[PDB]
Structure 1
Amino acid sequence: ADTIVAVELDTYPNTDIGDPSYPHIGIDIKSVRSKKTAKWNMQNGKVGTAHIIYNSVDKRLSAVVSYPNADSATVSYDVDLDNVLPEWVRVGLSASTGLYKETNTILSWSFTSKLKSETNALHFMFNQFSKDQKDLILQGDATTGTDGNLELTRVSSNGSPQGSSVGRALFYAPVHIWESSAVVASFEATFTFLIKSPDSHPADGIAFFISNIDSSIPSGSTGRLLGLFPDAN
């Protein structure tokens, strides 16, 4: 399979596969069964912000998700990505729907990678997305251009979300995420998102992920699997 490290914004509790009984943020290493989670007070139809950070000194992957004028949710997990990910990776955003549905709208996405061996750096910032965005690899139902936004999951003419949808956006360039002879390595990711649902049951969520360069949507990764994992193991 693909090797995946994700921060998930999980809107639908699947207690079947280890989810808590509420909307949560999670850190996923090689599995959809989060190594650490925190309660998330998801606000239907409000624009939220996700900030992910990691460095080779603390070897600690941390995420904060927040809305304006509300307490933020925060999750951290000690992990050396040197022992998990290959040296060269792609970074992306993933989303899915199942029986239940939500818009998975990305309004902005920025990423910074620094590697001191002589510092090498990569930085991109999207505050709008265009009709033909050639520095993104779009996978599944993901599209760009509607209101200058990235729609990870299928939305009908009227703006209504559809079920059984999976989409991903990967940045075109591979990223040197770690190196054997490296003194300090760090990365930071930010994205803004709008999750809107018709009912009280939004599903299934958004993830920032890091994968092998040649990563694709695994067969039947709709719903609970977030476009990231082939199975629930």
Structure 2
Amino acid sequence: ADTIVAVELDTYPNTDIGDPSYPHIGIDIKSVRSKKTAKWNMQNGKVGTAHIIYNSVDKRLSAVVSYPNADSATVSYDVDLDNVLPEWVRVGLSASTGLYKETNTILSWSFTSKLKSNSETNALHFMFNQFSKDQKDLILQGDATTGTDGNLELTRVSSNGSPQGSSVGRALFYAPVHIWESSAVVASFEATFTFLIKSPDSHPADGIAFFISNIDSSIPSGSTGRLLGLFPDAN
């Protein structure tokens, strides 16, 4: 199977796989059963922003999510990503719906990785504030599309803007990312994305994740709903 490190914005509490009984932000290390969660006051139909940060000195994966006019939610987990992930990875966004549903709309997505050696800097940076019909520097998987209202729709939306159930889709940056090099004295990354999660229902599902994977990563079979397009099962 794929190797996955993810930050999840989990809109639907599945308490039998260890979700808390509310929408939550979580850190996922090779399992949909988050190593750490925090309560998330998700706002149906409002534009949110998530920030993810990590460096190889501190070995702490941290994330913050907020809306305008609202308090933030934050979560952290101590993990050395050089012991979890391979040297080369792809970075992406993933979302799903199940029998409960929501839009998984991405308005913007930025990523920066830096490797400083003892010589110094290797860097990759991308920023999307608009997506075109044919976004050649993304790999779209499953139901993901680009260019509707200039946005990235990770899951299926009807012509009327209405979200569909039982949907899964991801977008990965085309270029592999080098997150470990033998001469690096500091390796760091940060990601930001802005999202619009909207549902006609009181119980939206299932969420959006930022993820880092082996470069050949694909949507596992049956990873709609609670598995967020990331994991083949709930182990």
TM-score w.r.t. the length of structure 2 is 0.98
Superposition map of 1:100-119 within 5 A? 100-116=100-116, 118-119=120-121
| 2:56 paired residue number | 56
Query: Tell me, what secondary structure is at the counterpart of 1:145?
Result: strand
Q: Distance in 2 between matches of 1:62 and 1:213?
A: 22
Query: Shift of residue 66 of structure 1?
Result: 0.1
Deviation per residue, 1:29-79 (Å, 9 max, x gap): 000000000000000000000000000111100000000111000000000
Shift of 1:230: 0.4
Match of 1:183, SS?
Answer: strand
Q: 1:141, CA displacement in angstroms?
A: 0.2
State the Cα distance separating 1:118 from its structure 2 match: 2.3
Paired residue for 2:195? Answer: 193
Task: Give the unaligned 5+ runs of structure 2.
Answer: none
User: Secondary structure, in 3 states, of the residue corresponding to 1:138?
Assistant: strand
How many positions carry a matched residue from both structures? Answer: 233
Out of 178, 181, 184, the residue aligned to residue 179 of structure 1 is: 181
Q: Deviations over 1:126-149 (max 9, x none)?
A: 000001000000000000011000
Deviation at 1:189, TM superposition (A): 0.1
What is the CA deviation profile of residues 158-177 of structure 1, one whole-angstrom value per residue up to 9, with x for unaligned ones?
11100000000000000001
Aligned to 1:80: 80
1:146-165 equivalence runs, <5 A = 146-165=148-167
Distance 2:234 2:189 in 1: 28
SS in 2 for 1:159: coil
* CA-CA distance at 1:228 after TM superposition: 0.2
Which of residues 210, 213, 216 in structure 2 aligns to 1:214? 216
Structure 1 stretches of at least 4 aligned residues deviating more than 6 Å after TM superposition:
none
SS at match of 1:16: helix
1:16 to partner: Cα distance: 1.1
Name structure 1 gaps, 5 residues minimum: none
| Aligned twin of 2:147 | 145
How far apart, CA to CA, are the structure 1 residues paired with 2:196 and 2:220? Answer: 25
